[PDB]
Design a protein around this ligand. Structure first.
Ligand SMILES: *[C@@H]1O[C@H](CO[C@H]2O[C@@H](C)[C@@H](O)[C@@H](O)[C@@H]2O)[C@@H](O[C@@H]2O[C@H](CO)[C@@H](O)[C@H](O)[C@H]2NC(C)=O)[C@H](O)[C@H]1NC(C)=O
Ligand SMILES: *[C@@H]1O[C@H](CO[C@H]2O[C@@H](C)[C@@H](O)[C@@H](O)[C@@H]2O)[C@@H](O[C@@H]2O[C@H](CO)[C@@H](O)[C@H](O)[C@H]2NC(C)=O)[C@H](O)[C@H]1NC(C)=O
Ligand SMILES: *[C@@H]1O[C@H](CO[C@H]2O[C@@H](C)[C@@H](O)[C@@H](O)[C@@H]2O)[C@@H](O[C@@H]2O[C@H](CO)[C@@H](O)[C@H](O)[C@H]2NC(C)=O)[C@H](O)[C@H]1NC(C)=O
Ligand SMILES: *[C@@H]1O[C@H](CO[C@H]2O[C@@H](C)[C@@H](O)[C@@H](O)[C@@H]2O)[C@@H](O[C@@H]2O[C@H](CO)[C@@H](O)[C@H](O)[C@H]2NC(C)=O)[C@H](O)[C@H]1NC(C)=O
Ligand SMILES: *[C@@H]1O[C@H](CO[C@H]2O[C@@H](C)[C@@H](O)[C@@H](O)[C@@H]2O)[C@@H](O[C@@H]2O[C@H](CO)[C@@H](O)[C@H](O)[C@H]2NC(C)=O)[C@H](O)[C@H]1NC(C)=O
Ligand SMILES: *[C@@H]1O[C@H](CO[C@H]2O[C@@H](C)[C@@H](O)[C@@H](O)[C@@H]2O)[C@@H](O[C@@H]2O[C@H](CO)[C@@H](O)[C@H](O)[C@H]2NC(C)=O)[C@H](O)[C@H]1NC(C)=O
Ligand SMILES: *[C@@H]1O[C@H](CO[C@H]2O[C@@H](C)[C@@H](O)[C@@H](O)[C@@H]2O)[C@@H](O)[C@H](O)[C@H]1NC(C)=O
Ligand SMILES: *[C@@H]1O[C@H](CO[C@H]2O[C@@H](C)[C@@H](O)[C@@H](O)[C@@H]2O)[C@@H](O)[C@H](O)[C@H]1NC(C)=O
Ligand SMILES: *[C@@H]1O[C@H](CO[C@H]2O[C@@H](C)[C@@H](O)[C@@H](O)[C@@H]2O)[C@@H](O)[C@H](O)[C@H]1NC(C)=O
Ligand SMILES: *[C@@H]1O[C@H](CO)[C@@H](O)[C@H](O)[C@H]1NC(C)=O
Ligand SMILES: *[C@@H]1O[C@H](CO)[C@@H](O)[C@H](O)[C@H]1NC(C)=O
Ligand SMILES: *[C@@H]1O[C@H](CO)[C@@H](O)[C@H](O)[C@H]1NC(C)=O
Ligand SMILES: *[C@@H]1O[C@H](CO)[C@@H](O)[C@H](O)[C@H]1NC(C)=O
Ligand SMILES: *[C@@H]1O[C@H](CO)[C@@H](O)[C@H](O)[C@H]1NC(C)=O
Ligand SMILES: *[C@@H]1O[C@H](CO)[C@@H](O)[C@H](O)[C@H]1NC(C)=O
Ligand SMILES: *[C@@H]1O[C@H](CO)[C@@H](O)[C@H](O)[C@H]1NC(C)=O
Ligand SMILES: *[C@@H]1O[C@H](CO)[C@@H](O)[C@H](O)[C@H]1NC(C)=O
Ligand SMILES: *[C@@H]1O[C@H](CO)[C@@H](O)[C@H](O)[C@H]1NC(C)=O
Ligand SMILES: [Cl-]
Ligand SMILES: [Cl-]
Ligand SMILES: [Cl-]
Ligand SMILES: [Cl-]
Ligand SMILES: [Cl-]
Ligand SMILES: [Cl-]
Ligand SMILES: [Cl-]
Ligand SMILES: [Cl-]
Ligand SMILES: [Cl-]
Ligand SMILES: [Cl-]
Ligand SMILES: [Cl-]
Ligand SMILES: [Cl-]
Ligand code: NA
Lengths: 526, 526, 526
């Protein structure tokens, strides 16, 4: 029986057998006051003693959020949907620790993605018992509020100041600072890791003065705050808060009255109107996201990055080979998970409209000009491939490269990976390739479990990735030093070296997407 | 209703609408005991609690000072004259803060120019509500004593020790250290900025051990302590204190009796005799200025600069294209604001006498030799242009370049600008060009106010300058990172790169006034 | 009336008119318990409150010491003899401060030479009122014990542990740390300066862990611990302590009994037998000097220097053109202050015997071979010049160069001077040239006093040297920045640049005495 005394009370955990060993999991520990009633849309408030043995033996509620009902019954999409009840009372975190209890273990804190509109820490692909077992690190993960409830912003107004879900993540990081030594953890060796919006969140904790001392290093998988979906302008946020108000009959003349009104709405009426706060959306819409609130984020983060105002530490950054494909089946014409999606030039052009709402005509021709000079015009999957690359390069890959470039110019070691392995079990079709989100199960070690029907080459790839992530967290260097592995070079402006992750053998290459990102990065920002 | 609790009591401010937003202004907060009676000519004494809600709702009195009556009725000159009552009771400061109240805002502290003989913080061109509104910085500005009342020196004698007006500025900087967090300010991010004598003052706070920890960075507009008007020798100061005494029938044998006598004179008798403490003056005379007092200034500041004894931090330094023209209408023969001032060779020579009192004949021929080799002797405005350049290069431009050169040799980033835009509203005539003092309204944002009849190109120039000054203060780097702007390089001995500020497009150039300043800087110091 | 409160009591000083200004001198303040009776040969003991206004209005007693009676009546020698009564009660120091009292003045602490056998701080050439007046520094100087009474060593035995006179200097440096702020001094800006044995002492305070935090920078005039006269081996010290014992009928079997016996002898019987503790001496004999005592000096100081174990700071080091001449009239055959001393080859060889006691015959031939290859054999002053250079290069110049070389290799700025001006008033004859000891009056400013019959070129030279020493102390850089002076380069291994000090104009040169010092430094150590 395992009871740990925390600053706020005792917690009981549960033992887990993993790979003939034991991990202790403390699932669903609370880290803030439930943000209900009068606390809705406010910054999370600190938690007071229970006393009391809190039983942390199951995952807690996930935060309220719309769910993906596009493919009912389909594992590829439904695997991302919440797997605990939804509730505004969702501010909990999970701790997994090796057994026997470590002495001063390095801590890995996971921040989930989901567009800032969705996600939960209890997903199966985020289960941190493999990492704790195999690498003897402690893994922590937290639920933070998403959608309007986590990011609604009425700028400067503490009733809805914005970034609440980023302040939830932050209060979780404090909880680790204050409490993790009790579980056997080293609060001085804490690495944040996150994917997509979770990565973008990691990148903003790098810029946030209040997070500076809550962690040591950072890992960004498929995301960074400079991605075009990751920060809402003050203009847009205002328009959106008011549009939500209007749609819920909460329009007022006094803004504090708007918020008061919205605090009376049911979680569901808020969720139902989120999608419409915007005249046209895309499959990549982030209606309620991070904003420059003067608190968490003191200035437009592009200025902070350019001028070197951020936590000085090592970063590990990466992307997958086919980032953009996943999104094309949520609204691009001619695209289906259920056929090979060979689309036409005219369809490609219609797709640009779906993904680039407006976007001058000249803007959209320019994408077309850049991506459709074939070599050569023979290949029927030409336009289908091009639309996926457009969406991935713009939304994920070039913004990750440009973040890494700018961060490293201030003197810190940065490591960049290009993940190019398609899981043998991917439920999505072949044409979608190495999709967004599908490195995650490799990082968390799921392929280490033989009972699971991954290939042997995949077990070995995962084992290597886990070692590299763990050495990065413990030592700031993502090497696998024992098995004559390719040495991972730092990424510098100038050479821009990166490491490819695949089952055959990993290469050092240079200047990923050079020609493409010159387009997105220099020209497109029409 | 906005009340802030300060170390010395409460203060009430007032709300201001600026650009559809709100700024809170706390005008006329006191920062020292009024320096009256027995405190006249003494260092400022700290302030004791009122208690009490101090109403900071209007600008305070300006310090006693002679006024410019050369052009009664004329906006070009009268705009610099005080606009609140004169009084020895003038030790107040102003705070402008964004609304809503910032969390930890960068602070900009303005130090006015006026030759150390005049000036006030309440002038319209020093109004810091635009900066606070637009950049969300806090702006502070203080009145400090000027003329004999601020700088009379009887060396080593604490009844008149010298530099009192520099100690007023310093006590204001402490007040910001102790109190600005209460208004939402970061005392660890404080930038001083000042023009002309205000800049010279900024440059001496860089050398003053007692100011070292009262600020972070420095901006010097048109001035630096090494300018020939900015520091009085001990010889001159003594002669001048005694001359003043003599002129007010205060001559004594005992020096403390001189001061005691002068403490009985009326503000006005002191002001009236200031101009005469010197056998011949120029339009650039600084009769009572900074001195090496062994307290504020521990050694001749040229030695401190050469040998690297100064606060190690970034500086932003600049000058205007026609610095010297403004002065020529206050006594050079043939010059008038009311015609094109085409003067003759013989007039030019008479002008050198006005500006270089004595100055050997050889000294003055040498200026003439250096500035009157025309290319070619055709042009009638030849001599008129030459006299203005003589006066600007000697008094402002070369001393600013040489300061920047010497400061940067010790390893700090320095940025240098050359301001070359003539305001569309300048009341002075065309031949006077881009005058001394007329970048100020651009730095403070006045052209951002459309209701004001500046051109569109001027709004844009001002907006850019404000961003560059603000990024310098917040991040030590005066870049405008968002609008594909010219990147501002650091100034190094060796290349001496500088940025030109004008409405068309800004250039990077090198070695401003190279041939001229070699003359003033190496040879002239005849 | 000027009274200063010190940690140990009050002290009254006296006002002095210097150059139409005022200096306050506190002459003869005590800094330790008188080391009498049972404290003889022991480390100095700290001082307890008097209370009490101590009157510091005259120089105190000088420490017991033999006196130079070679030239009774002659100013050249007698100027170095003590000018206050001799007494074991001699542990006092002097403070000179500018008036008005400075705020946080740099402190210069003088340590006198005299071979560790003689000297006193009250000499006229060490009077620090000119420095205090002219440069507004505070000057401190202390008497420390010399001869057997200051340096007798019975190794490891606290009754006579050795280096007592170096511990007197050290306790004086503490007194400045604890007390000088009260006089207006900055204990964080303290420079030690010393000549000959006083310089050697400065160089050992650089190596002494207990002095590390008692000062900032160091000046070494004509001396450094690696000079062949400056450190006594443990062998020699033992032999000498026992020889003294024997000569005073104090031989015992128990060593503590030897010391007890010697503590009963009269100052005079000790002084009288000092000269004989050694079978043969030279005019440069240092019978009782610094030793490696395991306390002040933890290891042979040559090892500490080579291996970089010393205070890391700037040093200023120098020598005079004719160091060795002064000594030749105290025993070399054919030499006289009263004729031109043209000696013969055979006389030169006899001189080597006087100066190199033993010294194999081969050792002495080798000096002769190195110094007597004339260019050419014509010149009658050939051998007279050669003997002086031998004595100066060996004893002073090469050891100063080698110290500077080795100190600078660890990364600190070092400045080296070669002083080549013969005082217009030197009482010694012309052939003796620029003698040892005769830069001192220039460093202390005596030529600044016109009433004194130095030439105008000498006033100017002294004024420059004073400025350079003062800037070194205040700023770590011995420049004279105002009068277009030659810039003094740092001394590096590799170039070995040095500055010449003379009345005409100073040069930068390289590799002083290169060929000579290769001999003394590499080969001679036969
Ligand atoms: C700010 O909002 C308006 C859209 O107004 C919205 O009303 C909301 C309650 C919501 O239902 C939303 O769907 C609706 O559009 C944006 O301007 C809109 O542009 C289109 C173009 O035809 C119009 O049809 C909309 O009605 C029009 N607004 C209206 C009704 O006046 C506007 O673009 C947006 N600003 C942004 C994009 O930041
Ligand atoms: C691949 O399928 C897409 C997706 O749309 C279809 O899904 C199919 C599996 C099928 O069940 C079909 O009924 C369903 O609508 C096809 O795109 C569609 O093309 C059809 C053919 O006319 C159009 O009618 C639809 O408008 C269009 N769907 C939309 C709204 O995007 C696509 O043609 C098919 N392409 C292949 C096989 O290459
Ligand atoms: C120090 O002052 C004297 C000037 O004496 C002055 O008396 C004052 C009260 C004031 O009224 C002032 O105008 C008057 O000059 C300077 O020397 C002066 O040089 C001129 C040359 O002819 C004489 O006419 C002045 O009278 C003469 N002084 C006198 C009257 O003895 C002197 O230059 C100045 N020192 C400086 C410049 O530092
Ligand atoms: C430009 O004007 C100057 C300034 O002096 C004059 O101001 C004018 C606008 C006018 O009202 C005139 O009365 C006033 O004195 C002129 O300099 C002057 O030149 C005049 C002509 O003789 C002389 O008499 C004055 O001594 C001299 N003024 C002084 C004391 O500086 C100047 O000539 C004129 N030049 C032009 C038009 O190019
Ligand atoms: C250690 O001392 C002896 C010298 O013994 C000395 O007795 C002393 C009291 C003193 O009077 C001193 O003058 C006398 O020499 C040194 O050895 C000496 O070498 C010479 C060579 O002929 C002899 O004449 C000395 O007497 C002889 N010592 C004796 C008497 O035994 C010895 O060199 C010295 N060790 C050193 C130099 O460290
Ligand atoms: C320079 O003088 C030296 C020093 O010795 C002498 O001092 C002289 C001023 C004179 O009074 C003389 O009496 C005194 O002894 C001379 O050296 C001496 O040379 C003499 C000449 O025979 C010898 O007898 C001495 O032994 C020797 N003195 C010693 C002991 O050193 C020297 O000769 C003289 N040389 C010149 C003038 O060039
Ligand atoms: C735990 O280690 C603490 C220092 O941690 C450092 O070492 C590594 C873990 C590295 O990743 C860095 O994060 C850290 O700088 C030490 O101060 C504590 O005392 C230790 N606590 C224990 C063992 O109880
Ligand atoms: C306010 O920030 C403090 C540190 O300020 C630094 O960050 C920038 C503002 C920069 O310009 C530098 O001037 C500073 O080094 C921090 O110590 C305080 O805790 C903060 N105070 C708050 C938020 O209350
Ligand atoms: C006196 O100055 C102190 C710091 O002294 C530094 O500055 C120069 C004097 C330099 O030579 C260095 O020696 C020192 O690092 C400061 O800490 C004290 O507060 C000052 N004391 C006063 C003015 O009372
Ligand atoms: C808490 O849960 C544990 C684990 O299932 C159980 O054994 C324990 O009795 C529970 N305690 C209570 C009563 O909350
Ligand atoms: C807005 O209404 C809220 C309701 O409590 C009130 O607190 C606030 O003062 C009001 N402000 C105004 C006048 O708009
Ligand atoms: C190294 O390879 C071995 C087998 O040769 C494998 O079992 C092990 O897991 C590998 N270690 C890592 C961290 O990849
Ligand atoms: C101070 O001035 C304010 C603003 O005008 C006013 O409302 C307030 O009543 C004043 N308080 C007093 C009586 O000083
Ligand atoms: C000068 O006069 C003042 C008047 O108070 C006095 O304090 C001071 O001691 C006097 N000094 C002298 C003697 O000059
Ligand atoms: C950038 O340019 C835009 C318009 O393209 C302008 O409105 C904005 O004020 C500029 N920003 C700065 C800081 O110059
Ligand atoms: C100390 O000496 C001073 C200066 O000569 C003298 O004025 C004072 O009275 C003395 N005090 C005593 C009695 O020691
Ligand atoms: C030496 O004699 C001293 C005299 O006090 C004594 O203290 C010490 O113990 C003696 N040691 C011996 C036995 O040599
Ligand atoms: C500089 O030279 C001047 C005269 O030109 C002289 O009076 C002054 O003492 C010099 N300063 C120094 C420090 O040498
Ligand atoms: Cl799965
Ligand atoms: Cl087309
Ligand atoms: Cl093809
Ligand atoms: Cl590529
Ligand atoms: Cl105006
Ligand atoms: Cl002429
Ligand atoms: Cl021409
Ligand atoms: Cl130019
Ligand atoms: Cl003398
Ligand atoms: Cl021979
Ligand atoms: Cl010859
Ligand atoms: Cl030489
Ligand atoms: Na040899």
């Amino acid at each position: 029986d395992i009871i740990i005394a925390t600053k706020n009370g005792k917690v009981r955990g549960m033992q887990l057998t993993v790979f003939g060993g034991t991990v202790t999991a403390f699932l669903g520990i609370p880290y803030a006051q439930p943000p209900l009633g009068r606390l809705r849309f406010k910054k999370p408030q600190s938690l007071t003693k229970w006393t009391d043995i809190w039983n942390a033996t199951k995952y807690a509620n996930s935060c309220c959020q719309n769910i993906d009902q596009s493919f009912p019954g389909f594992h590829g999409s439904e695997m991302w949907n919440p797997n605990t009840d939804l509730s505004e009372d969702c501010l909990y975190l999970n701790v997994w620790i090796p057994a026997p209890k470590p002495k001063n273990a390095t801590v890995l804190i996971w921040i989930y993605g989901g567009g800032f509109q969705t996600g939960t820490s209890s997903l199966h692909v985020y289960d941190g018992k493999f990492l704790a077992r195999v690498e003897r690190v402690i893994v922590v993960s937290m639920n933070y509020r998403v959608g309007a409830l986590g990011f609604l912003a009425l700028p400067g107004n503490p009733e809805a100041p914005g970034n609440m879900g980023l302040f939830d993540q932050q209060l979780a990081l404090q909880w680790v600072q204050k409490n993790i030594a009790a579980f056997g953890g080293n609060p001085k060796s804490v690495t944040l890791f996150g994917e997509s919006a979770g990565a973008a969140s990691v990148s903003l904790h790098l810029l946030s003065p209040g997070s500076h001392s809550l962690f040591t290093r950072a890992i960004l998988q498929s995301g960074s705050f400079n991605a075009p979906w990751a920060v809402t302008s003050l203009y847009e946020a205002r328009n959106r808060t008011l549009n939500l108000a209007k749609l819920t009959g909460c329009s007022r003349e006094n803004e504090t009255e708007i918020i008061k009104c919205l605090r009376n709405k049911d979680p569901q009426e808020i969720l139902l109107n989120e999608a419409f706060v915007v005249p046209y959306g895309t499959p990549l819409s982030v209606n309620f996201g991070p904003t420059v609130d003067g608190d968490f984020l003191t200035d437009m983060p592009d200025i902070l990055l350019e001028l070197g105002q951020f936590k000085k530490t090592q970063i590990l950054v990466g992307v997958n080979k086919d980032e953009g494909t996943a999104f094309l089946v949520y609204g691009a014409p001619g695209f289906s998970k259920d056929n090979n999606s060979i689309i036409t030039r005219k369809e490609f052009q219609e797709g640009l409209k779906i993904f680039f709402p407006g976007v001058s005509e000249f803007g959209k021709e320019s994408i077309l000009f850049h991506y459709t000079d074939w070599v050569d015009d023979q290949r029927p999957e030409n336009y289908r491939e091009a639309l996926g690359d457009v969406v991935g390069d713009y939304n994920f890959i070039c913004p990750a490269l440009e973040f890494t470039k700018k961060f490293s110019e201030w003197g810190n070691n940065a490591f960049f990976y290009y993940f190019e392995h398609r899981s043998s079990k991917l439920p999505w079709p072949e044409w979608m390739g190495v999709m967004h989100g599908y490195e995650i199960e490799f990082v968390f070690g799921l392929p280490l479990e033989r009972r699971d029907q991954y290939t042997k080459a995949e077990e070995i790839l995962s084992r290597s990735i886990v070692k590299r992530w763990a050495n990065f967290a413990k030592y700031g260097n993502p090497q696998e030093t024992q098995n004559n592995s390719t040495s991972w070079p730092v990424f510098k402006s100038t050479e821009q070296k990166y490491l490819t992750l695949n089952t055959e053998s990993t290469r050092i290459m240079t200047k990923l997407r050079a020609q493409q990102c010159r387009f997105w990065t220099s020209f497109f920002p029409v």
